[PDB]
Amino acid sequence: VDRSNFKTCDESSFCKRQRSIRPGLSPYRALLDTLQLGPDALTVHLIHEVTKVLLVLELQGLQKDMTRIRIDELEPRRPRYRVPDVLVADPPTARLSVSGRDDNSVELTVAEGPYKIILTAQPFRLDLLEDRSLLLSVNARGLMAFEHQRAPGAWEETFKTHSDSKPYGPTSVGLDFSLPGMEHVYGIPEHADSLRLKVTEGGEPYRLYNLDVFQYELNNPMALYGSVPVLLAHSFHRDLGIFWLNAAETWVDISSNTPQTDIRWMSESGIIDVFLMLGPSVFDVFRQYASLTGTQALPPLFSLGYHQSRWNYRDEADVLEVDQGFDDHNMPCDVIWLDIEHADGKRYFTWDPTRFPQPLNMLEHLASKRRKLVAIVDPHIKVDSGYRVHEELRNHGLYVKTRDGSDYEGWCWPGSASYPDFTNPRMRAWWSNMFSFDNYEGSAPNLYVWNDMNEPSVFNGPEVTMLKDAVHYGGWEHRDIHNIYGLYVHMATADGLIQRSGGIERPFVLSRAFFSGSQRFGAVWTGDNTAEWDHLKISIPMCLSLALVGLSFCGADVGGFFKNPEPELLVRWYQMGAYQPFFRAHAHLDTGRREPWLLASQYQDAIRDALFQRYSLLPFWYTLFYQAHKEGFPVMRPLWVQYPEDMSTFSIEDQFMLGDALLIHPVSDAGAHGVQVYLPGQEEVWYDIQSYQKHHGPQTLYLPVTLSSIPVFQRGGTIVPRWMRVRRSSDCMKDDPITLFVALSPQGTAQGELFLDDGHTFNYQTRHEFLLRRFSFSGSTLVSSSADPKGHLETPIWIERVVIMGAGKPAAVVLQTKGSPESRLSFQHDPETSVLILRKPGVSVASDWSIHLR
Amino acid sequence: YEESKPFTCLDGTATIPFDQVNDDYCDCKDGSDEPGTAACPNGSFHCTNTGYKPLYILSSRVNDGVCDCCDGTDEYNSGTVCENTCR
Ligand SMILES: O=[N+]([O-])c1cc(-n2ccnn2)ccc1NCCCCCCN[C@H]1C[C@](O)(CO)[C@@H](O)[C@H](O)[C@H]1O
Numbered sequence A: 001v002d003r004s005n006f007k008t009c010d011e012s013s014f015c016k017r018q019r020s021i022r023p024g025l026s027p028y029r030a031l032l033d034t035l036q037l038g039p040d041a042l043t044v045h046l047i048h049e050v051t052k053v054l055l056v057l058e059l060q061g062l063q064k065d066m067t068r069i070r071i072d073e074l075e076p077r078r079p080r081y082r083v084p085d086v087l088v089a090d091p092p093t094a095r096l097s098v099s100g101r102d103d104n105s106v107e108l109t110v111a112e113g114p115y116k117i118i119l120t121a122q123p124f125r126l127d128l129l130e131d132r133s134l135l136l137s138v139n140a141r142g143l144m145a146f147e148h149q150r151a152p153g154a155w156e157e158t159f160k161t162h163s164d165s166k167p168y169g170p171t172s173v174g175l176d177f178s179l180p181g182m183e184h185v186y187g188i189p190e191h192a193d194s195l196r197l198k199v200t201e202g203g204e205p206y207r208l209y210n211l212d213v214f215q216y217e218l219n220n221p222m223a224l225y226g227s228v229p230v231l232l233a234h235s236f237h238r239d240l241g242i243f244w245l246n247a248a249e250t251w252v253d254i255s256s257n258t259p260q261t262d263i264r265w266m267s268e269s270g271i272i273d274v275f276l277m278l279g280p281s282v283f284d285v286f287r288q289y290a291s292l293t294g295t296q297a298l299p300p301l302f303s304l305g306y307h308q309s310r311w312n313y314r315d316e317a318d319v320l321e322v323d324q325g326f327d328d329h330n331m332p333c334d335v336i337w338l339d340i341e342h343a344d345g346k347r348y349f350t351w352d353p354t355r356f357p358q359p360l361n362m363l364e365h366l367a368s369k370r371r372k373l374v375a376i377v378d379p380h381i382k383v384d385s386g387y388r389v390h391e392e393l394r395n396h397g398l399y400v401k402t403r404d405g406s407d408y409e410g411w412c413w414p415g416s417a418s419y420p421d422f423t424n425p426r427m428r429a430w431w432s433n434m435f436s437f438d439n440y441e442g443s444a445p446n447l448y449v450w451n452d453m454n455e456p457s458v459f460n461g462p463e464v465t466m467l468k469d470a471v472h473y474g475g476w477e478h479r480d481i482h483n484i485y486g487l488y489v490h491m492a493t494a495d496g497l498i499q500r501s502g503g504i505e506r507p508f509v510l511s512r513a514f515f516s517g518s519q520r521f522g523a524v525w526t527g528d529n530t531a532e533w534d535h536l537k538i539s540i541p542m543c544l545s546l547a548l549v550g551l552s553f554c555g556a557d558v559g560g561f562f563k564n565p566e567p568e569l570l571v572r573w574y575q576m577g578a579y580q581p582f583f584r585a586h587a588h589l590d591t592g593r594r595e596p597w598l599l600a601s602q603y604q605d606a607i608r609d610a611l612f613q614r615y616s617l618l619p620f621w622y623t624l625f626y627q628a629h630k631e632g633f634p635v636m637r638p639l640w641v642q643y644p645e646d647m648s649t650f651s652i653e654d655q656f657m658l659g660d661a662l663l664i665h666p667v668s669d670a671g672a673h674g675v676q677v678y679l680p681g682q683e684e685v686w687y688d689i690q691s692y693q694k695h696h697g698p699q700t701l702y703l704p705v706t707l708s709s710i711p712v713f714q715r716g717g718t719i720v721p722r723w724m725r726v727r728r729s730s731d732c733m734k735d736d737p738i739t740l741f742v743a744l745s746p747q748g749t750a751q752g753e754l755f756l757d758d759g760h761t762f763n764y765q766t767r768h769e770f771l772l773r774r775f776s777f778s779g780s781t782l783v784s785s786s787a788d789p790k791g792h793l794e795t796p797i798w799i800e801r802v803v804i805m806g807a808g809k810p811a812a813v814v815l816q817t818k819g820s821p822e823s824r825l826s827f828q829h830d831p832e833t834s835v836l837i838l839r840k841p842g843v844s845v846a847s848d849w850s851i852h853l854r
Numbered sequence B: 001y002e003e004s005k006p007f008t009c010l011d012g013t014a015t016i017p018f019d020q021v022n023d024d025y026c027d028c029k030d031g032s033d034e035p036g037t038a039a040c041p042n043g044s045f046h047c048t049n050t051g052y053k054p055l056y057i058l059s060s061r062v063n064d065g066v067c068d069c070c071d072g073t074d075e076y077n078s079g080t081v082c083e084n085t086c087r
C-alpha cells in the first residue's frame, strides 16, 4: 500500500485538534436548574465554562438494559446530522426517576432497578451502575469536545491536490468512556488487524472511514472498506458494548490502565449519539444491539454454497465451460460470478454485445444445471449521453452535486462517472425499480447482484473517495453521510431483487462497503486480500470482528485476490473458506486461472474433500443463520463467546466456533506437520469428526495433519444435521434426507435444532411455511419435537441415518412415530471408537418421533 | 411353499435381504445395492439410451432435477420432466 495518499490523524485537522485534548479537568458542567424529566428522556443543559456554549444532553434509559446518550447544541445556527435508516425502530424507553440528589450530583434509577445513572454536575460526568457495581463512566478523563457551529486546516483545508471548502468550519464531536475491570476490547471493523484490539496510545487511532486501499497491508489500523462503530468489552465477570451512532469520519483511541480500558470516539460532524449495552452476558449484548439495528438477513440456501468467481470470465462459452468443469470433475458449485468485464464498457445493467449477446440463454443453461449467477453492479454511472441510466439520473436530478449545483463527476472504471445520491429515497426507489426484469434486460430470477466500489471509490478523489463538500439530499454534506453511502447501495439493491419478484424471493447481494445495519441486506467480504499465508491467517480475526458486530455473512477471497497462490496455499484456503460463512474464490485480472480442477490430482482431491464437507453441513449452516436471523447471535464465534470465563481464550484468533457445536482450527502454515488445538471447557468432551476420537478439555492437543486435514471437532452435548448425499448444487439437495450426528456429553446428553423451508422465499415469514425441529438425547432416548409449532412445511425430507459418538453397543434399537407401529432398526457399532450408527429410521423430518436404545 | 434368496454385495462386504436393494439407503460399500437410487456416494446409474450410446452417471445425479441421460430416465421422481433427446 502507498500510505501517502491516506491521512494520518495528524493530517486530519479535526483528529489533530481532538487528539491534542489530553486527559484532564473537563470544562463542561451540567446546569441542574435546567434539569427536566420528560416522558421518554431526561434533558439537562450543558455549558462550556470558558466559551459559554450551551449544549443539551438527552439521557434515556431503554428497555433491555440499555442507555442512550445524545448531546446537541441548544440553539444551533443550522441543524446537525442525525443518522437515519440505521435503527430499525424507535427504541422503547424505560422511565427514569430521581433517587438521590446533592449540590453537585443527581442519581437516576432506570424503571425500578437495578440500573442507576449518576449525573455529576461539576465537572460533567455520567456513571452507570448495577446496584452498587460501577459498570461504566462517561467523560471520566474529561475528553469531551463539542465544536459548535460558527459564522459560515480548521476551515478551508487541502490534502495533496484536493481542496475541502469546509463551509461550516470545525464541527467535530468527541467523548470518552471508562470500562473498569475490562482488559479486552473487540469490534469497530473493518481493519486488517488482530481480533483483540490494540492500545492506540503510542501510535495511530483506529480509523472508521469507508476507503478503497489498494494492496492493503496487515497489522495496522488504517481504515478499510467498511465501518461499524460498535465496540465490545469482555471480562471474566461481565460483557459490555458501545454503539457510537455517527456516520461521519470517526477515530477511536484505546488506552489501558484496578485493570481498566478507556475508549474515546472522535467524529467530524453530526451529534453525539451513543448506546450503552449493559449485558451482562455477551449474548445479552447481541440481543441489545440486534433490537437497535436488526438481525442478519436470512440468506437463500444457494448463497451458502460455493461461489466460483474471478476477474474475469471471457464470455458465455467460458461461463458454460466453468459450469461443465465442475460436473466433469465432480465438484459442487452453486454460483458463477460475472465481474465488470461482462458489461458494455463498464456501463452497468448492460451486457457486452460480443461476449454476452444472449444472457437469457446463458441464465437458462445455468438454471437447467440448477445453478445461479451473480453480476456486478457498481454505484458509479459512466458520463455518457448514450447511456440510458445516466440520462435518467441526469434528467431527474438524482446525482450527488457540488456546491455550485452541478452534478459531481469523478473517475472510476468507465472513466468519467457520476454518483447517484443513494441517501435520497427517491433515488433508492429508482435504483430498486431498475432491477425489474423489464428494466434490467437480460436478467432472470437466477441472476443476483454484487455491489462493489460503494465506499464510494473515486480514483481522482481525496483518499480515493468523494470530496467532503459534495452535497446530498436535504443539503447535507458528504462528510456528514460518508459511512452509510455503501449501506444505502446495498439496501436499494436488495430491495430491488425483492420487488422484481413481487416481494416473494429473498435477495442475495454482496457489498464491499458497510455500516451498522448492513447485516439486514446480505453479505460482505474483506475486499482485495493477497495470495499469502498471512492473509489466509487474518481472515479469521477479520470476519470474527464482523461477527461480533452483527455482520455474520462474512468471508475473504479464497486463494487471495492479488498474486498467484502456490497449490498448497490454495488447498489450505479452500479448507479455511469451507468453514467460513461466505465461501467464494476470486482473483485479480492478471492472475493465472485457478479453477480447482486445474491443479494436480492430489491438490484437486483435498479441495473436493473440502467442498463436500461444506455441502454436507448446509443444514447446519442454514440453521445457524436462521438463529442469527431470529435472535441476533453470530454464526462464526470467538472461543471466548462460548467460554467467557477461560481467560486463555480471550485473544485466540487461529481458532473459531460455528455456533456452539463445531470448533475449527484450519492449517494455515506451509509444510505444517501438525497443529496445536486448544479444546476448552471443564468437564467438556470434543470429538475429532474424522477419527471419532474423544478428547477431554481443557487441553492443548497436538494433532498431526496431512494435506487433506481440516481439524474440526464436535462438542459433546450437541447434535449436528448433515446432508450426506453431496450433489452438484444446493438446489439439487434441498429435498434430500438428513443424517444426525449426536455427540454425547459426559452426562450422556445432547441437543440440537434444524431449520427447513423452501430455501429461497419469504414464505417462512408471510405464511409460516417452515420447520424448526428440536433434537434431544437423554438417558438412552433420542427425541424429535417441534421447537416452533407455528411452522408447517410440505417436504419429503426424512431421517436416513443417526450417528452417535460416545455410545456403547445396545441390545436393540426401537423407533416410535406418531401414526406408525413401533419399529425395530438395525444398527452397527464400533467398539474401538464407540460410534453407533442407526440404519434408516425412515421417519419424516416433520414428524415427532423417538428412538430408544435398549 | 417355496422361498426367496438374499442379495450379496459385489465386494462381499455384506449380504442383505432383497428388500434392501434399491430401498434408498446405502448398504454396500461399493454402492452395488442401490443402482437405481441416489443413496450411495460411490454408486452408478445406467442410462440405456435407446437410439444413442448408453451411459453411466453418478448416483448423486439420480433425481437431482438435472437431465443427465438423453432418455431422461435418471429423473423419475424429482419434479423435472426430461424429454427424450437421444436423436
Ligand atoms: O494501481 N492503482 O493504484 C490504480 C490507479 C488508478 N488511477 C486512476 C486515476 N488515478 N489513479 C486506476 C487504477 C489503478 N489500479 C487498479 C487497482 C486494481 C484493484 C481492483 C480492486 N478490485 C475491485 C474491483 C474488481 O477488481 C473489479 O470489479 C474486483 O475484482 C474486486 O473484487 C474489487 O475489490
Ligand SMILES: [Ca+2]
Binding pocket: B020, B021, B022, B023, B024, B025, B026, B027, B028, B033, B034
Ligand atoms: Ca440398500
Ligand SMILES: [Ca+2]
Binding pocket: B061, B062, B063, B064, B065, B066, B067, B068, B069, B074, B075
Ligand atoms: Ca439427473
